[PDB]
Amino acid sequence: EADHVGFYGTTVYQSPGDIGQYTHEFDGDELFYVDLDKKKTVWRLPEFGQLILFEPQGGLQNIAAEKHNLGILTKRSNFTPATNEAPQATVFPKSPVLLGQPNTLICFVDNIFPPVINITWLRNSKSVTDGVYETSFLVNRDHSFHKLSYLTFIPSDDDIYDCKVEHWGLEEPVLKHW
Amino acid sequence: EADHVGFYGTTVYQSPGDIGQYTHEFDGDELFYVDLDKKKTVWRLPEFGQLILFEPQGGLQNIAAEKHNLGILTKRSNFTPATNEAPQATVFPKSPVLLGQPNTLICFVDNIFPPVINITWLRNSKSVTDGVYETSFLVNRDHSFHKLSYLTFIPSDDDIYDCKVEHWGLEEPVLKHW
Amino acid sequence: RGISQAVHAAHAEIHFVVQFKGECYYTNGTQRIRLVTRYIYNREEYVRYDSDVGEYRAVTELGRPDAEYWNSQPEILDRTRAEVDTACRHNYEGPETSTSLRRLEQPNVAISLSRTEALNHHNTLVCSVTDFYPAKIKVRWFRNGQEETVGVSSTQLIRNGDWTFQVLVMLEMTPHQGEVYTCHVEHPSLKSPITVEWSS
Amino acid sequence: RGISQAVHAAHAEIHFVVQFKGECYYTNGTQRIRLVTRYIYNREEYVRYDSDVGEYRAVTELGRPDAEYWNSQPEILDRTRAEVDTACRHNYEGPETSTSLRRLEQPNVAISLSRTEALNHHNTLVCSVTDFYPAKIKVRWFRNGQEETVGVSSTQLIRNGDWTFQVLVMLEMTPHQGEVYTCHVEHPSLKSPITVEWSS
Ligand SMILES: *[C@@H]1O[C@H](CO)[C@@H](O)[C@H](O)[C@H]1NC(C)=O
Ligand SMILES: *[C@@H]1O[C@H](CO)[C@@H](O)[C@H](O)[C@H]1NC(C)=O
């Protein structure tokens, strides 16, 4: 066919916090992630989780393998820590903006290292949550990550929006207005 | 066919200086202009001047008609003069720039009112002339004009160029570098 | 068919600029011909004659007199009216057909790489179709046979001023392989489509 | 064909981040399959296993040990080698074929006018083809039947993140008449080309 690349086995782990993640993607799209604290596979496309199965244990093994490897590498590196990077976000509609017409607003945050972020939406300058969704930390070739959030809205009113990006290789949260 | 618009009879005349011009164009391209001080039709495309003829007298009549009309209108207007506009130029190659490869550089000056301009090229900051060519004052819908100049060059050396645009609805000459 | 006619500028009744514009608009060749003459004082059109209207009309106060006068001078008003046939119909079917309308300039396709980068995220290929007349031209970017439309950007038409135009079409690519990038060009002056090739 | 396989992360010999990347590259479907696993410490890949190389290789000093160890552990080195078949060949031909590869999302063509202008010189028409999967799509601007390529500009692909993309194609026009502007779109999910119309 065409070029296709599968991302099968992707594991992340961070030390203070024992925070980890495991995912699978195809052509840059997230197939599913495995809920670790509750040990279950969460398909981004439900219809997909009904035709194909992935036992969580698999993901769970790699997380352990990495917990293991982190402790070993951290030492080997004589404890060099992660140097911080500043993310860049982008807000845009998933569909043609029509007056009164329900839409979903998307915020694209890239250059995320580490996989620690608080991306937050607000017309106000204080939050509003319904239709607020998030993807897992998507992997980048340069070993940085990127995350997307959504907002479900219909356009006339209060119309000012903002995607607040809090990350410490960073300062103003990043208020990206739309 | 397609839309085509002929510009047949175009005459310009300015008072102090008795400076005038007469031209003919087709689809925005200058067919010819009539040398007034020497009463002869100068075809931009010579090959064209050999298959079609335009007696200069025609152009000459309109120039007179306008000399006439100017004196009458100027009075009628209770002598209101022309308000000055500032031109904007653009320099660009007529062909793909190849190292050592002869080319012609073009300077596009628009928003020219009045039809009085000194557009001048220089690597130096003092002129250089050969291949220096100019078109007549081309007419714009808004009754402003635009003029183009050319320069014949081969690209490696002294490589700095400049199109100097002197016009009094204007100040720095307009040094547009390339 | 070898004599180019002008549009006569009328005489008014007995830094300063004036302009007289004879303008002829051809819809589908000479099917529908329209004549518009305009008298300008500096940058203000004051009077106008339009085929569609049939007579002189003042565009501003400065034109009120010339309209009332010229429209009443049978010689003038009737010479201008027929000017659409004497000068336009004539100039189109005659001079222009054996000259402007027959001119065909074959373009020059050349793919170069942005002067120095294909950097800062996504390589940009540039196709330079230059020195063609007339303006109707079709330039498409292709990838191994498949027509590429996404990531493609074309400039507006560039009128050189010497009866030749040019056009540059960009393509931002994230490439791979024995891919071929064919710059398809289609110009009326050409028998069959000229094409340039480039590969990874 | 209903079980999705992972790529096993090896065990080293006995703000901090590590990443393990199982990556499988399919050239022309499963004709040529390539397996690349990478072990990352923060943002530094230290060791890698590549199908093309057949064994673990240290990318940096931090990886020298894991390579020499894993390559000597028959169980490990041989489990990884076959991982291209166990996980990739399997996941491609199996899971992915009944899911990602069969997904077809019909785009939504809509021509709007730039939010408020068609001003400051040359009107710009925008075609918005959104919500399609997969990414191969052909969107062309047409003028009364003639395909318009000049003055046309397409954005790069926009990945929405929900398994849907979108793309906007601009056209700067200097219009006239009963002209029709047809936004031709061609997507694999479609039987015959969807088209939207707009007129002056
Ligand atoms: C004018 O247009 C019509 C329809 O497009 C065509 O049949 C006719 O031949 C055209 N006339 C010329 C001179 O091209
Ligand atoms: C692989 O590519 C070749 C040539 O393009 C083709 O003949 C073959 O059928 C392809 N295989 C698949 C699974 O599409």
Tab-separated table of N, CA, C and O in Angstrom, chain C residues 87-146:
chain	number	residue	atom	x	y	z
C	87	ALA	N	-12.918	51.572	-33.976
C	87	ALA	CA	-11.675	51.256	-33.275
C	87	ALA	C	-11.593	49.873	-32.622
C	87	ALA	O	-10.587	49.171	-32.754
C	88	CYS	N	-12.637	49.466	-31.920
C	88	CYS	CA	-12.601	48.187	-31.229
C	88	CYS	C	-12.821	46.966	-32.075
C	88	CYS	O	-11.980	46.061	-32.106
C	89	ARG	N	-13.977	46.920	-32.723
C	89	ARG	CA	-14.312	45.797	-33.573
C	89	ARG	C	-13.146	45.691	-34.544
C	89	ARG	O	-12.577	44.613	-34.754
C	90	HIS	N	-12.778	46.836	-35.113
C	90	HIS	CA	-11.685	46.883	-36.067
C	90	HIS	C	-10.367	46.402	-35.496
C	90	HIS	O	-9.745	45.496	-36.044
C	91	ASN	N	-9.940	46.993	-34.393
C	91	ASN	CA	-8.645	46.685	-33.769
C	91	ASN	C	-8.627	45.228	-33.297
C	91	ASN	O	-7.544	44.592	-33.326
C	92	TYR	N	-9.734	44.694	-32.829
C	92	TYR	CA	-9.741	43.322	-32.342
C	92	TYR	C	-9.580	42.341	-33.494
C	92	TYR	O	-8.592	41.628	-33.571
C	93	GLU	N	-10.598	42.316	-34.351
C	93	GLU	CA	-10.651	41.441	-35.508
C	93	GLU	C	-9.487	41.669	-36.470
C	93	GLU	O	-9.029	40.734	-37.149
C	94	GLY	N	-9.004	42.905	-36.538
C	94	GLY	CA	-7.907	43.217	-37.435
C	94	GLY	C	-6.503	43.072	-36.883
C	94	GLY	O	-5.911	41.996	-36.923
C	95	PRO	N	-5.946	44.155	-36.337
C	95	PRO	CA	-4.588	44.160	-35.779
C	95	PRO	C	-4.316	43.095	-34.728
C	95	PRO	O	-3.452	42.235	-34.913
C	96	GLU	N	-5.056	43.157	-33.625
C	96	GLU	CA	-4.874	42.208	-32.535
C	96	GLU	C	-4.902	40.723	-32.908
C	96	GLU	O	-4.163	39.920	-32.334
C	97	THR	N	-5.729	40.350	-33.875
C	97	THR	CA	-5.802	38.951	-34.261
C	97	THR	C	-4.525	38.463	-34.942
C	97	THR	O	-4.164	37.292	-34.819
C	98	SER	N	-3.837	39.351	-35.655
C	98	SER	CA	-2.614	38.958	-36.357
C	98	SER	C	-1.392	39.260	-35.533
C	98	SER	O	-0.269	39.235	-36.026
C	99	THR	N	-1.595	39.535	-34.261
C	99	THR	CA	-0.453	39.872	-33.461
C	99	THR	C	-0.480	39.378	-32.016
C	99	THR	O	0.222	38.422	-31.675
C	100	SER	N	-1.285	40.008	-31.171
C	100	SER	CA	-1.356	39.621	-29.769
C	100	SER	C	-1.982	38.245	-29.610
C	100	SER	O	-1.470	37.387	-28.893
C	101	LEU	N	-3.086	38.037	-30.309
C	101	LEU	CA	-3.812	36.787	-30.219
C	101	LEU	C	-3.121	35.583	-30.815
C	101	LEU	O	-3.497	34.450	-30.531
C	102	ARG	N	-2.115	35.807	-31.640
C	102	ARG	CA	-1.441	34.671	-32.236
C	102	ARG	C	-0.135	34.351	-31.524
C	102	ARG	O	0.495	33.329	-31.795
C	103	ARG	N	0.258	35.208	-30.590
C	103	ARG	CA	1.495	34.987	-29.866
C	103	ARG	C	1.429	33.806	-28.897
C	103	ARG	O	0.523	33.714	-28.061
C	104	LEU	N	2.407	32.909	-29.030
C	104	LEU	CA	2.520	31.713	-28.196
C	104	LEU	C	3.956	31.555	-27.715
C	104	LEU	O	4.879	31.366	-28.507
C	105	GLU	N	4.136	31.648	-26.405
C	105	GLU	CA	5.453	31.535	-25.801
C	105	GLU	C	5.538	30.318	-24.902
C	105	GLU	O	4.843	30.229	-23.890
C	106	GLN	N	6.398	29.380	-25.279
C	106	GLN	CA	6.591	28.151	-24.521
C	106	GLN	C	7.389	28.444	-23.246
C	106	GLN	O	8.511	28.950	-23.312
C	107	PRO	N	6.813	28.113	-22.069
C	107	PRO	CA	7.411	28.321	-20.742
C	107	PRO	C	8.661	27.503	-20.509
C	107	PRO	O	8.973	26.608	-21.286
C	108	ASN	N	9.370	27.806	-19.428
C	108	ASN	CA	10.592	27.083	-19.111
C	108	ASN	C	10.547	26.528	-17.689
C	108	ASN	O	10.792	27.233	-16.703
C	109	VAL	N	10.216	25.244	-17.614
C	109	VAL	CA	10.099	24.517	-16.362
C	109	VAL	C	11.455	24.199	-15.743
C	109	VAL	O	12.361	23.709	-16.421
C	110	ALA	N	11.582	24.476	-14.449
C	110	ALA	CA	12.820	24.217	-13.728
C	110	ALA	C	12.568	24.056	-12.230
C	110	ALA	O	12.037	24.959	-11.590
C	111	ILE	N	12.930	22.902	-11.677
C	111	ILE	CA	12.709	22.663	-10.258
C	111	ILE	C	14.051	22.927	-9.615
C	111	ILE	O	15.091	22.421	-10.041
C	112	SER	N	14.028	23.751	-8.592
C	112	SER	CA	15.225	24.085	-7.877
C	112	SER	C	14.859	23.742	-6.446
C	112	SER	O	13.745	23.294	-6.177
C	113	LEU	N	15.806	23.919	-5.540
C	113	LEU	CA	15.559	23.679	-4.131
C	113	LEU	C	15.715	25.051	-3.475
C	113	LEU	O	16.631	25.800	-3.826
C	114	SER	N	14.820	25.396	-2.551
C	114	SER	CA	14.877	26.698	-1.883
C	114	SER	C	16.318	27.077	-1.605
C	114	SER	O	17.057	26.304	-1.004
C	115	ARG	N	16.705	28.271	-2.056
C	115	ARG	CA	18.066	28.767	-1.878
C	115	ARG	C	18.526	28.545	-0.451
C	115	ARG	O	18.344	29.386	0.434
C	116	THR	N	19.070	27.357	-0.230
C	116	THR	CA	19.666	27.024	1.045
C	116	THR	C	18.957	26.393	2.245
C	116	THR	O	19.481	26.526	3.353
C	117	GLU	N	17.816	25.728	2.131
C	117	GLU	CA	17.351	25.172	3.373
C	117	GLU	C	16.776	23.768	3.352
C	117	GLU	O	17.496	22.788	3.592
C	118	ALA	N	15.477	23.649	3.069
C	118	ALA	CA	14.872	22.333	3.148
C	118	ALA	C	15.262	22.106	4.583
C	118	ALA	O	15.826	21.082	4.917
C	119	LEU	N	15.015	23.130	5.395
C	119	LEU	CA	15.371	23.057	6.791
C	119	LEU	C	14.231	23.575	7.607
C	119	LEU	O	13.171	23.903	7.067
C	120	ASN	N	14.448	23.654	8.902
C	120	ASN	CA	13.423	24.174	9.811
C	120	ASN	C	12.118	23.462	9.484
C	120	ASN	O	11.096	24.140	9.357
C	121	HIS	N	12.082	22.149	9.305
C	121	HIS	CA	10.798	21.480	9.135
C	121	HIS	C	10.023	21.498	7.753
C	121	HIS	O	9.296	22.401	7.442
C	122	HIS	N	10.232	20.441	6.981
C	122	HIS	CA	9.594	20.075	5.720
C	122	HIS	C	10.204	20.704	4.406
C	122	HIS	O	9.794	21.757	3.976
C	123	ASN	N	11.071	19.959	3.708
C	123	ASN	CA	11.717	20.372	2.453
C	123	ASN	C	10.805	21.033	1.435
C	123	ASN	O	9.763	20.452	1.146
C	124	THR	N	11.175	22.171	0.846
C	124	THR	CA	10.288	22.830	-0.147
C	124	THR	C	10.855	22.898	-1.574
C	124	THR	O	11.860	23.564	-1.841
C	125	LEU	N	10.180	22.179	-2.470
C	125	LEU	CA	10.526	22.116	-3.883
C	125	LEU	C	9.830	23.252	-4.612
C	125	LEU	O	8.644	23.513	-4.380
C	126	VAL	N	10.556	23.911	-5.505
C	126	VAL	CA	9.987	25.018	-6.258
C	126	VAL	C	10.053	24.809	-7.763
C	126	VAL	O	11.130	24.580	-8.315
C	127	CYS	N	8.899	24.883	-8.421
C	127	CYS	CA	8.861	24.760	-9.868
C	127	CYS	C	8.731	26.162	-10.467
C	127	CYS	O	7.830	26.925	-10.112
C	128	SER	N	9.640	26.508	-11.369
C	128	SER	CA	9.613	27.824	-11.978
C	128	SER	C	9.268	27.795	-13.461
C	128	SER	O	10.108	27.493	-14.314
C	129	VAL	N	8.010	28.101	-13.752
C	129	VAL	CA	7.520	28.144	-15.115
C	129	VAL	C	7.558	29.612	-15.482
C	129	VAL	O	6.743	30.407	-15.006
C	130	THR	N	8.520	29.969	-16.324
C	130	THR	CA	8.688	31.356	-16.715
C	130	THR	C	8.764	31.571	-18.210
C	130	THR	O	8.983	30.629	-18.966
C	131	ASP	N	8.573	32.830	-18.605
C	131	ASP	CA	8.629	33.289	-19.992
C	131	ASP	C	7.586	32.771	-20.979
C	131	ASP	O	7.886	32.520	-22.158
C	132	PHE	N	6.349	32.631	-20.513
C	132	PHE	CA	5.258	32.179	-21.374
C	132	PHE	C	4.274	33.306	-21.628
C	132	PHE	O	4.173	34.272	-20.849
C	133	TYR	N	3.612	33.194	-22.764
C	133	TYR	CA	2.597	34.134	-23.168
C	133	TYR	C	1.761	33.134	-23.984
C	133	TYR	O	2.317	32.375	-24.807
C	134	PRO	N	0.494	33.154	-23.815
C	134	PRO	CA	-0.408	33.971	-22.920
C	134	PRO	C	-0.434	33.351	-21.569
C	134	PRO	O	0.184	32.344	-21.305
C	135	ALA	N	-1.206	34.044	-20.729
C	135	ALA	CA	-1.362	33.697	-19.358
C	135	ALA	C	-2.055	32.404	-19.020
C	135	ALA	O	-1.815	31.919	-17.928
C	136	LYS	N	-2.889	31.811	-19.876
C	136	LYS	CA	-3.529	30.573	-19.450
C	136	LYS	C	-2.507	29.457	-19.403
C	136	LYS	O	-1.929	29.086	-20.426
C	137	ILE	N	-2.275	28.939	-18.202
C	137	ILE	CA	-1.320	27.854	-18.006
C	137	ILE	C	-1.758	26.958	-16.866
C	137	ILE	O	-2.325	27.423	-15.874
C	138	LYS	N	-1.485	25.667	-17.014
C	138	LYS	CA	-1.823	24.693	-15.985
C	138	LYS	C	-0.554	23.977	-15.504
C	138	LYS	O	0.055	23.203	-16.244
C	139	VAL	N	-0.168	24.256	-14.258
C	139	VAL	CA	1.019	23.674	-13.634
C	139	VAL	C	0.652	22.818	-12.400
C	139	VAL	O	0.146	23.337	-11.405
C	140	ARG	N	0.910	21.512	-12.473
C	140	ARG	CA	0.600	20.593	-11.371
C	140	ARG	C	1.806	19.828	-10.837
C	140	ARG	O	2.678	19.427	-11.604
C	141	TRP	N	1.846	19.620	-9.521
C	141	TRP	CA	2.939	18.873	-8.902
C	141	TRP	C	2.470	17.427	-8.757
C	141	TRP	O	1.339	17.174	-8.341
C	142	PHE	N	3.350	16.492	-9.111
C	142	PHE	CA	3.068	15.054	-9.062
C	142	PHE	C	4.077	14.288	-8.226
C	142	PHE	O	5.247	14.651	-8.172
C	143	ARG	N	3.620	13.206	-7.601
C	143	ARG	CA	4.492	12.339	-6.807
C	143	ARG	C	4.325	10.927	-7.342
C	143	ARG	O	3.264	10.320	-7.209
C	144	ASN	N	5.377	10.411	-7.960
C	144	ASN	CA	5.345	9.076	-8.538
C	144	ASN	C	4.093	8.782	-9.345
C	144	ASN	O	3.575	7.672	-9.306
C	145	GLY	N	3.597	9.763	-10.078
C	145	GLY	CA	2.417	9.506	-10.865
C	145	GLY	C	1.186	10.067	-10.208
C	145	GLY	O	0.297	10.544	-10.901
C	146	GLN	N	1.114	10.014	-8.883
C	146	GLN	CA	-0.052	10.562	-8.211
C	146	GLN	C	0.066	12.094	-8.198
C	146	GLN	O	1.136	12.645	-7.924
